[PDB]
Amino acid sequence: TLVHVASVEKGRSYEDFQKVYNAIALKLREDDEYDNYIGYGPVLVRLAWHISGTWDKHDNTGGSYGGTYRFKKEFNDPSNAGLQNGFKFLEPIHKEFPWISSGDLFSLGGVTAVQEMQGPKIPWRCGRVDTPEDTTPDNGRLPDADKDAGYVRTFFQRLNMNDREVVALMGAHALGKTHLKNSGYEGPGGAANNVFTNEFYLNLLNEDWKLEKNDANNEQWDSKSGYMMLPTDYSLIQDPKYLSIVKEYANDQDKFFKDFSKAFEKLLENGITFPKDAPSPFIFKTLEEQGL
Numbered sequence: 001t002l003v004h005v006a007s008v009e010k011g012r013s014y015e016d017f018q019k020v021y022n023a024i025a026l027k028l029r030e031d032d033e034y035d036n037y038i039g040y041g042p043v044l045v046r047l048a049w050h051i052s053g054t055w056d057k058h059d060n061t062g063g064s065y066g067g068t069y070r071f072k073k074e075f076n077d078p079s080n081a082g083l084q085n086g087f088k089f090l091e092p093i094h095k096e097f098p099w100i101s102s103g104d105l106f107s108l109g110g111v112t113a114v115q116e117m118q119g120p121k122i123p124w125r126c127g128r129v130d131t132p133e134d135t136t137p138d139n140g141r142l143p144d145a146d147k148d149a150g151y152v153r154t155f156f157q158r159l160n161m162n163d164r165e166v167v168a169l170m171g172a173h174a175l176g177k178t179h180l181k182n183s184g185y186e187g188p189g190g191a192a193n194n195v196f197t198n199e200f201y202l203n204l205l206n207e208d209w210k211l212e213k214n215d216a217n218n219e220q221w222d223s224k225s226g227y228m229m230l231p232t233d234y235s236l237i238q239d240p241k242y243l244s245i246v247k248e249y250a251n252d253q254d255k256f257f258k259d260f261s262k263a264f265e266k267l268l269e270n271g272i273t274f275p276k277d278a279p280s281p282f283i284f285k286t287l288e289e290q291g292l
């Protein structure tokens, strides 16, 4: 009974949004020291996921539309610890382009980051509209990491995501790292953690994983190379259906890129109704493609 209709920021077109993307991308290129020289790319993708992943398909609460992560209940969710760095990064961009909605900015940061980390193009649509403080979802809607594949499958069905979508989306765990102070997990998933590749899947299959307890007394899978997987990550090689898809993405980066692009756009758009005459989705040029 609750419907969020996309409403284009008044008088804006593709070219305006490309300007915002460019701002984000130039700042990503500039702020390269963050997190031991990873850069802000990974935290921006986690932000776009965590603002979208509060969605509940059953009643259309949560989701990216309302830009509710600007409110303290959501900003202070334990599940979002560390994401304040991404929000602060986006602050000067919102000042430069005050006409953009919060949901549009947060979601566009994620798209920007994937594309500037040499990932696939991710079509993106404008029209999210800030909603009031009382529409902010309660904490507890983002997933736990200390679970098995059954949990992961059930959790993601709330986001209308199926097996292929869940395994595709998880390959964003090639990016960045876990930080003990944020989540009670520590270490990167791979060597190339600010370039978007199929490394997550290759590492799951090819590394020699040992189950260990970390300094916060949580179990994680640790490799002789100094990489980690969360229990939920490692579950993708435990469940038969997931392991098939992991092997597929390990064998074929082009396919992973295609499936990730679709899944991530779907995630970022869950809960939004695009009127049949809205603009077609935007595909933004990278800085490289523009000579910038």
Ligand code: HEM
Binding pocket: 042, 043, 045, 046, 049, 081, 082, 143, 144, 145, 146, 152, 169, 170, 172, 173, 175, 176, 177, 178, 179, 180, 181, 182, 183, 184, 185, 230, 232, 264
């Ligand atoms: C079962 C579902 C998931 C669980 C339990 C999970 C859990 C986690 C945890 C615990 C971290 C570490 C946070 C920190 O300590 O800073 C992390 C990081 C990350 N997550 Fe996920 N995640 C899930 C799905 C996803 C999805 C769907 C995406 C995006 C498509 C994503 C993108 C990332 C990124 C890019 C990072 C690295 C952030 C950084 O380096 O600052 N995650 N995730």
Ligand SMILES: Nc1ccnc(N)n1
Binding pocket: 173, 174, 175, 176, 177, 178, 187, 188, 189, 190, 228, 229, 230, 233
């Ligand atoms: N960087 C990350 C984030 C989450 N999971 C793994 N294995 N690596």
